Symmetry: C2
């Protein structure tokens, strides 16, 4: 009865259940302890069923990382895409989304941590990182080029400025998860807005 | 058979050192969730009878490693501030240089920090190592940001919030160097940090009040 019952679920639903089991096992066991046998016992499905769709642990883990990062990117792109009057309203919309409960909640931190640990070893995972971190900076690069044009800053290295702002957001996201009482989500927005003020006040010059 | 001259002969502080390094190697290979005192002894090359006997458990070995690692970073970062030209910007620049030097930018330890940070949420003792050491790291940066503000002389600068911003930037940059060393050079990381200070000095320090 397991061979039919999993299979009769909708594709997006089968996929979501396996990624949820991969995430739970990464939390409990770390990347090195996750196995397809654990993931399938967590999911409540047969291992033979899964061997057909996935190569192994690396493939399951990569699909989970792809989905989590895809989700972030949709919320952040959505925030920009619905923002109005130009570069700073767009950055603000981004900063607000970044420190919303959706993105700031540390539920998945151990997963992220597990993902980041596997980046240096597994090409499948290393590639998801490079792709997603580049997609993420490309979004900031766009709005920073827009901001430079408004400025209009002569030869602004938007790529390096994007590495700066992404690093700040990352650092704030991480510290927040390690202890949420260090600063409030609103202080997080305020810090990011101060960084953009800093550029408009003349720091753009340091970025070529 | 080298717990005989590798553990038998040494002082308790020198066997602590050995255990700290076995704990870090075990964390890099098994993760925190997968590490155990047995797997720690497997790295030390000594028996687990021995180390049960002399130690409380895994949580306590990992907290000791965490304390050693953070202690060392802080020594080096304090050193760089103490031996820099007296002024606020030269002290910050020395901090940035130390931060992106091969010693603190060593990607080998990334795995160790990742394992500590995962233990922070579920093990309160590790949590408390985090809070304390992050507290000390920021206190160092608040002292020099206050010097900066006084040189400036900025009326009501929230040097505490400024220090959270700057620590966040450093953390973020350190993490990206380790996840992909090709993204930007150590020189560029310094440059990004100086650019942040420039930003403050250019007038962004005004946002640090509300």
């Amino acid at each position: 009865n397991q061979e039919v019952r999993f299979s009769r679920l909708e594709p997006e639903q089968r996929k979501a259940l396996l990624i949820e089991a991969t995430l739970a096992c990464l939390k409990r066991h770390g990347f090195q302890g996750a196995s397809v046998r654990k993931i399938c016992a967590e999911a409540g499905v047969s291992v033979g069923l899964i061997n057909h769709h996935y190569d192994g642990k690396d493939a399951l883990v990569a699909e989970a990382y792809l989905a989590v990062t895809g989700r972030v990117m949709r919320l952040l792109r959505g925030a920009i895409d619905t923002a109005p009057g130009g570069a700073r309203p767009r950055l603000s919309a981004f900063f607000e989304a970044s420190f919303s409960a959706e993105l700031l909640d540390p539920q998945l931190l151990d997963a992220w941590l597990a993902f980041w640990g596997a980046v240096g070893s597994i090409e499948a995972i290393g590639r998801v990182h490079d792709h997603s971190y580049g997609e993420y900076r490309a979004l900031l690069v766009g709005v920073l080029r827009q901001l430079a044009e408004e400025g209009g800053w002569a030869d602004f290295d938007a790529e390096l400025a994007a590495i700066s702002l992404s690093a700040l957001l990352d650092g704030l996201w991480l510290e927040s998860g390690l202890n949420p009482a260090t600063f409030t989500p609103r202080q997080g927005v305020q810090i990011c807005e101060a960084w953009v003020d800093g550029l408009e006040a003349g720091a753009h010059r340091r970025f070529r």
